[PDB]
């Protein structure tokens, strides 16, 4: 039983960062080589484990996520960092044990007229608790008077469209990010490569 890693990476239409989708992986023989042999990565930061030994350790559960974020915002996907992505969209824990693989996919997204299908949240009452997803379109009460649904003055919609297009700089083109999170605990080991 091989491991569905090609369906996580080579998958069209990655979900937007404000609604990232978990892809919990279990009952597999995961070979962390199809990951390494897939395109020149813009950032291959691995926290808590050595990426050269990922083919040996067995964990209990590994999660995969799928983003589309700006080029300058990939630096916010790291433990103990703050911003507009790592505060209201995706908060990594302070004891993270995983990898922060990120591409530079610009020829798939960023339509010439403008790709408005990717939305990120910039408005929230408080910072996101680590590993929490907030799918909500309630009008943000940025003022004092109540909003009551209407998007009037001091009443803004939290989600904002990235508006990618194939003319922006290297730091602003679409960037697909896939983060793998490993948890090891008292449950029997389930996922590792052929080498044990």
């Amino acid at each position: 039983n091989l491991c569905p890693f090609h369906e996580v990476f080579n998958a069209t239409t990655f979900a937007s960062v404000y609604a990232w989708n978990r892809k919990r992986i279990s009952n597999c023989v995961a070979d962390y080589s199809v990951i390494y042999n897939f395109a020149p990565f813009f950032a291959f930061k691995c926290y808590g484990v050595s990426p050269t030994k990922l083919n040996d350790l067995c964990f209990t559960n590994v999660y995969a996520d799928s983003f589309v974020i700006r080029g300058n915002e990939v630096s916010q996907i790291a433990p103990g960092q703050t911003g507009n992505i790592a505060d209201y969209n995706y908060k990594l824990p302070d004891d993270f044990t995983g990898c922060v693989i990120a591409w530079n996919s610009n020829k798939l997204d960023s339509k010439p007229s403008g790709n408005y299908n990717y939305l990120y949240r910039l408005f929230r009452k408080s910072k996101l608790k680590p590993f929490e997803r907030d799918i909500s379109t309630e009008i943000y009460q940025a003022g004092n008077k109540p909003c009551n649904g209407v998007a009037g003055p001091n009443c803004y919609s939290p989600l904002q469209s990235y508006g990618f297009r194939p003319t922006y700089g290297v730091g602003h083109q679409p960037y697909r990010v896939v983060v793998l999170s490993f948890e090891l605990l008292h449950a029997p080991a389930t996922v590792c490569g052929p080498k044990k």
Epitope: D87, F123, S126, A142, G143, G163, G169
Partner: antibody, heavy 117, light 107 residues
Framework: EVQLVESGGGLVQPGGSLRLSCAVS????????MTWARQAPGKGPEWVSV???????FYADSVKGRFTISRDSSKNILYLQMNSLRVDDTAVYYC???????????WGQGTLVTVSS | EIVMTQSPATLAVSPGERATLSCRAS??????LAWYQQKPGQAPRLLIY???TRASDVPARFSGSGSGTEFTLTISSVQSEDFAVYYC??????????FGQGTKVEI
Amino acid sequence: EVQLVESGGGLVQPGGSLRLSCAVSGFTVSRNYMTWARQAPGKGPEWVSVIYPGGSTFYADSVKGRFTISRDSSKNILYLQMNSLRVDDTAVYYCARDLTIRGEASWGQGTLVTVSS
Amino acid sequence: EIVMTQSPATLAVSPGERATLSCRASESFNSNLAWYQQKPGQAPRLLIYGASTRASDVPARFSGSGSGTEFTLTISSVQSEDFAVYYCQQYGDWPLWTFGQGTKVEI
């Protein structure tokens, strides 16, 4: 009618401390991006510090480790604490509920900060 | 970060005539440029946001255009009051931005 009033400007010897207050009327200071912009008397305004509606604070490279930006939602006031002031930092300081992406930017009247010996 | 330069620095146009400003960016950013107007002794006021969209209470004469690294502000006809300093701000890394230097419009 969004209004912002700065206070605390004046003359301070180099290396001193200065607390700039910002009375904001029209909305809440603890639920909006607040920036402390600085304009030299001979060029365009430059950003110094910014506070998110969550609590995260960012500072400019030239001012990192010296200025502390704080908020008081009880009285709806933005504070900027000024430490290790230099002759360079003589300018006019403005508050700003930036929100430039949404097309709503309000800048305060601003106050003059002069550092000389 | 991105450095922004606007020329000419001493634009002079008689009232009621077209004025063509210009801004230039060191690199390419995500089409996030704003045009600001600042009269002497006053705070900067939003005039154009998104490099092509006017803000509220902005007269129809002002119009931004251009994309990439070349952005242009066009005033249909200045009338005795638009004589102020105009800046091109780039909020490509919002809420972090850098301003221009000045395009003071003299009568």
